[PDB]
Design a protein around this ligand. Structure first.
Ligand SMILES: CCC(CC)C(=O)Nc1cc(C(=O)O)ccc1NC(C)=O
Ligand SMILES: CCC(CC)C(=O)Nc1cc(C(=O)O)ccc1NC(C)=O
Ligand SMILES: CCC(CC)C(=O)Nc1cc(C(=O)O)ccc1NC(C)=O
Ligand SMILES: CCC(CC)C(=O)Nc1cc(C(=O)O)ccc1NC(C)=O
Ligand SMILES: CC(=O)N[C@@H]1[C@@H](O)[C@H](O)[C@@H](CO)O[C@H]1O
Ligand SMILES: CC(=O)N[C@@H]1[C@@H](O)[C@H](O)[C@@H](CO)O[C@H]1O
Ligand SMILES: CC(=O)N[C@@H]1[C@@H](O)[C@H](O)[C@@H](CO)O[C@H]1O
Ligand SMILES: CC(=O)N[C@@H]1[C@@H](O)[C@H](O)[C@@H](CO)O[C@H]1O
Ligand SMILES: [Ca+2]
Ligand SMILES: [Ca+2]
Ligand SMILES: [Ca+2]
Ligand SMILES: [Ca+2]
Ligand SMILES: [Ca+2]
Ligand SMILES: [Ca+2]
Ligand SMILES: [Ca+2]
Ligand SMILES: [Ca+2]
Lengths: 390, 390, 390, 390
């Protein structure tokens, strides 16, 4: 009878450092003998004794003969696979959990909960799996590509919270939050505040009663919608991040969005999932965010930190913490997760490093990990090492 | 000292949805580096903490050099292999349990029981394996290809029941039922009623005292012989399904078989294993059946449901529940199994999707899973995604 | 604190049947993607909860580029590998225990004991490994290729007994028996009686106090030296098998060796490891032996049984029990082992099926298993299914 | 709640013998189907119930297409991988622990501690990982390629000690020792005595209170700096080995370094990690050392023993114990580790056998193991068996 998991104080530290790189395609050469899966939207989720590396595979390998459509996101073949953190995700190594083109997963400290989203675009569906059993589902409410976090959900006392969203990519996409337990939705929280477009939320626990989410707005602003979920009263409001250090992509010069906090600025059509994680201290609270180096393209990734304050109203720029990836390497989706050590949690930030070589070749990604270890300053950057011509 | 397993109330729900697809041959391209096994007659069987994906391999892989005879069913090389549900069944991933060209497996909630059938056609033999030890056997009684369920058997309080059959494909094939425990046959139940031809029985627990089986009659009717096994008195009778929604293949227009329930109608030489599973409710009982879309060919697969009643005498047609596979994709053997969640059972229906490209190429199959999750209606269908030319 | 293992009453039965075939080279085609190891002298050994398939690999795979010398037996590369029974022994699947060109392994019911033999021909050495630690060794006493059983050893109350032998192939090879415990030799038993040549002993427990061994004499007779080890007084004597059903290879017409039991007959230079296992009944004792069909070549394998009596003085011929392999298939080393079920032991006989295609190609073997299941008569035979040209 | 580990009395014995060879590249032929990793600096570290084989992979396989730079030591792709001792370290078989081009690992008898070193040359960084969590770090103090042991660290009562060093290859490289516990540095020990250059220390427990290290001096002498760490007072001093049997490479004729113990002799620019391990007896203490056969090149490896005495002042030559590898085979890094058996420790010495074929081909290594088993004298040598042209 294990015990439910709760967020604890982070482990002693003051900087992030390169920890691990998973470059499956370093072994997919034509002259090689490996079958690394072609995937995208990878993230990490950790339980009390193990961390797992989830991803959305196109049910194809490299080398392989199904490179066509691997650039697309939604299709009937896509599946949510996963391997223990550290193993190369190969055909034989990974385990397929369910058909899905959008997903997330979390551990309530007793069992794994898998969330997948598939079905027709105008009527997609969320599927909750608790261990080996398919336990529940949620239907599309705005009837426009029901999608999910694309990163770990968050459990507490057996209660797991997950953002979902239905809505147009260029229009309105009011998100929701499902309170899950043992695999069955026990309540849906409808957020208030600026809710015209949230999605690909990167949620984490700021405290035992509050969950914050650095999310993505694809149509109205380069600013990041910020969710503050009160687990206590099970209510959630959203407001834009006030910092001049815009975390979306594309974005304009930092601080170039005149007006007050709520100001959307130019549309800057598009966005991207951003990494974000909490560092809980006895009396302080550090918020770590990721964001591509290029402000127009998904290249490079720099770390930013900001202790205490109110993301909703603080115009102050974030403190550049270092470069995790250079503008010469790809820097796509960024996510957050916390490794659980003896008596403290280790906040981490993973970076999807897509190997994009067009739409006439394979389309996959490597995963770079950076965690909070000791003091000093970020020392090294990460490269995939992959040549797409092999 | 684990506890014996018993069938419990299904989990809350009212519809089936695509859950998982296992397409091993998505990685068997000539330019790939995987060794997926060439198999057929796959099914699933779940224990208290894990589900396994069994199949009958021709002891060959793709790409490979032993594609000849993989279309045949019986030979001295065939073996009953199995992998945990979710893993791709490769040479290295699967485990060979015993030489067999016909089989089944169930978990008494304490240990796995494997059943295999091999030997000469006119004197085949059933082999029971309880874990690692070969525990017993049953001989051919009608001396004509002793065959078995081709899907999970069913245990209760340590008592596992399994249909077997000896008999001509075009003639009489009176089936039997073996009461097994700890691997040794403790009694054989001889069914009564219409018993001229039953086989490839798809059995499940309608209740703690009754096991029902939607079976196959290859020579006399497109209707499905229906077995009702009383675990209590250990007796079994068979009678045809009265519904106008004929579940075999080939079959004639629905409802075109005039006469009373027992009416065999035209022979319609041939048949196929059909999926069928129970959804036990406190006061209701839902019976789910599968059947190909085409009435003459093994293409497509639609779901049908019918709550309560007596399959033996209800002429009413089944309620179409949705399309699991389209007539453009292959739809062969269908089976039933129940995933065991915390306090309830999740009824599922798997579909064998054979990649038939003739008898001068490899002959294998993918497995599609659909389970009972939440309400609404079946949203998406399943495709193998496999190109046999690769 | 597990409990030491002891031999128990066999499980109910009266015949042997094909159980499992491990044909690793069914997946070693040039066009395949598997790396099955090239091995020889395979055997099986079972612990309370698992059976393992050991072999001596030439540290090479098929397809591979080190086929040269794989026909040879002794070299510095050879290793004792092993996989769980049922898995194909591939490069990635197996585990290398120690450098050895001769070996054996047994489970005292608490931990695995591995025995390997390597070193220079004129001064080989036996190495005992208890789990992960290298625990002891035994030196060559006759200074002529110290070799070992080539099959499972036998433990009882933590005491494991293993035959070893030093001596010329064409001359004298007086064998010995090491009493091992927790990996360290605690006594060496020197057999009496006809001891001019014993080797490749296939030992098993006839009872809780007696171990019998059907062994091999390569230079003096087609008859099989028979060892009777009294675990009680830790003494052992050897005498030839008196039956006219000569079990060695090559051999002359059955019963053609005139004279009394002890009569060696013609030399018939050569021999082979023979399968042999006990079936202990409350008041009866069945001895199962294997032997090639051809009396001059290692092709085919037939089963022979003989209940009660004294192998040392019974001239009566063995009762042919059936054909496990036909003269069209190779039939090399045969061994015995007992699977441990709930409360009884299942006697089995495995058959090495070497794929010999000369000395200018790869040289490996498949393993066929036949166990004691139910009554009736052996129904089917075993074929490797392997084409060496692929 | 496992118990902390402590060094115990070695197991009964008086000689070393070939135990195991791991030649991953025996399966990397162009015509093969395996993906063995390209690695270097391999070592072994054992916990109470398992031994693991660590190495530093260049994140590439053979056959593969990234052979360039595999000769180099430091780069952003390098990772500390590991597999259970006995398994071939393949892409799929191994587990990546962290990005690192220098490392070590030990088991406190409760959990694994991994140490990795990466970052910029002039500001490298040591990373401690305790299980799945990144727990701490140490910065470069001499700002010149912070490097580490390259072999197992040593725990006692939960306290793990590890040598690190910062400094020029041709100049000064004063080393340090980190006292770790549960993954966090709790104290740094600064050695005294001759400390102008120590590194690649091969440490082991001479007793429950003393740790000795046979290290490497790359610029001042062919003699081996010897560290004696008192776990009790947590202090460490270093002095050169006085024996005429110089263990470094290159070295001059044995005993050719005139003067007293402390005499450095000629520079003999360069060095190599040397194997060294303790054999603790109730009243005696055997020190085992390894060293290449050639005194100028890294070929061959012979074993040397010396019981009792003071390495710091004993001019007596070591007792040649045997040849583990011949001058025809490569003999690079040598390391020590102790397998833990029931109630005693088994001292072992592993040998890295690099397959160097230039800088225009792949650059990897095999691992040879030799342990203390029984009496007699080392009987056999070890060969890789690998042809680099395949
Ligand atoms: C452009 C598609 C749109 C969906 C409304 C969206 O913003 N979601 C979305 C975007 C990306 C990406 O920009 O890389 C990847 C996956 C997505 N997830 C899915 C489910 O497509
Ligand atoms: C046509 C063979 C006949 C056997 C009497 C039969 O109906 N059994 C049978 C049929 C199929 C199929 O129709 O696909 C597959 C396997 C079978 N199982 C076996 C054991 O062949
Ligand atoms: C012909 C070699 C001789 C050794 C004295 C022997 O009888 N042992 C021996 C024989 C065979 C075989 O006949 O197939 C295989 C392995 C053997 N084992 C070894 C260790 O070679
Ligand atoms: C020549 C490089 C120098 C580093 C100051 C050194 O002596 N370290 C060092 C040497 C070798 C070798 O000689 O084979 C291998 C790895 C090393 N480790 C690293 C970290 O390079
Ligand atoms: C940041 C924080 O307070 N985390 C808490 C921890 O202090 C407490 O031990 C546990 C109580 O449920 O929940 C978690
Ligand atoms: C459908 C049904 O009644 N299933 C039963 C369950 O109610 C009961 O807990 C158990 C008793 O043996 O057996 C199972
Ligand atoms: C054949 C035989 O007697 N086997 C015995 C078994 O009866 C007994 O339970 C046990 C006692 O040690 O040892 C074994
Ligand atoms: C060589 C030596 O003394 N090793 C000791 C062992 O004797 C003792 O049982 C234990 C006590 O902590 O620590 C270790
Ligand atoms: Ca594999
Ligand atoms: Ca945006
Ligand atoms: Ca494999
Ligand atoms: Ca029919
Ligand atoms: Ca593999
Ligand atoms: Ca003979
Ligand atoms: Ca693999
Ligand atoms: Ca030196």
């Amino acid at each position: 009878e294990p015990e439910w998991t709760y967020p604890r104080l982070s482990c002693q530290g003051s900087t992030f450092q390169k920890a691990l790189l998973i470059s499956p395609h370093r072994f997919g050469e034509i002259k090689g003998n490996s079958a690394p899966l072609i995937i995208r939207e990878p993230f990490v989720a950790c339980g009390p004794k193990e961390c797992r590396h989830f991803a959305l595979t196109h049910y194809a390998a490299q080398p392989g003969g199904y490179y066509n459509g691997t650039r697309k996101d939604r299709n009937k073949l896509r599946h949510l696979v996963s391997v223990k953190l550290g193993k190369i995700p190969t055909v034989e190594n990974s385990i397929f959990h369910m058909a899905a083109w959008s997903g997330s997963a979390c551990h309530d400290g007793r069992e794994w909960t898998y969330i997948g989203v598939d079905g027709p675009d105008n009527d997609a569906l969320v599927k909750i799996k608790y261990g080996e059993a398919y336990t529940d589902t949620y239907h599309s409410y705005a009837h426009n590509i029901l999608r999910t976090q694309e990163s770990a959900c968050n459990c507490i006392g057996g209660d797991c919270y997950l953002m979902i969203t239905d809505g147009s990519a260029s229009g309105i996409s009011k998100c929701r939050f499902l309170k899950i337990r043992e695999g069955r939705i026990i309540k849906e929280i409808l957020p208030t505040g600026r809710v015209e477009h949230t999605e690909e939320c990167t949620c984490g626990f700021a405290s035992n009663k509050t969950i914050e989410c650095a999310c993505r707005d694809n149509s109205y602003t380069a600013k990041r919608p910020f969710v503050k979920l009160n687990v206590e009263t099970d209510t959630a409001e959203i407001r834009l991040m006030c910092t001049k250090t815009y975390l979306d992509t594309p974005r304009p010069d930092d601080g170039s969005i005149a007006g007050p906090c709520e100001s959307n600025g130019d549309k800057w059509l598009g966005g991207i999932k951003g990494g974000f994680v909490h560092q809980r201290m006895a009396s302080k609270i550090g918020r770590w965010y990721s964001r591509t180096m290029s402000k127009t393209n998904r290249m490079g990734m720099e770390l930013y930190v900001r202790y205490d304050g109110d993301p909703w109203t603080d115009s102050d720029a974030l403190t550049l913490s270092g470069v995790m990836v250079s503008i010469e390497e790809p820097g796509w989706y960024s996510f957050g997760f916390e490794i659980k050590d003896k008596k403290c949690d280790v906040p981490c930030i993973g970076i999807e490093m897509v190997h994009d070589g067009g739409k006439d070749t394979w389309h996959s990604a490597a995963t770079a990990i950076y965690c909070l270890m000791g003091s000093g300053q970020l020392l090294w950057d990460t490269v995939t090492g992959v040549d797409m011509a092999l």
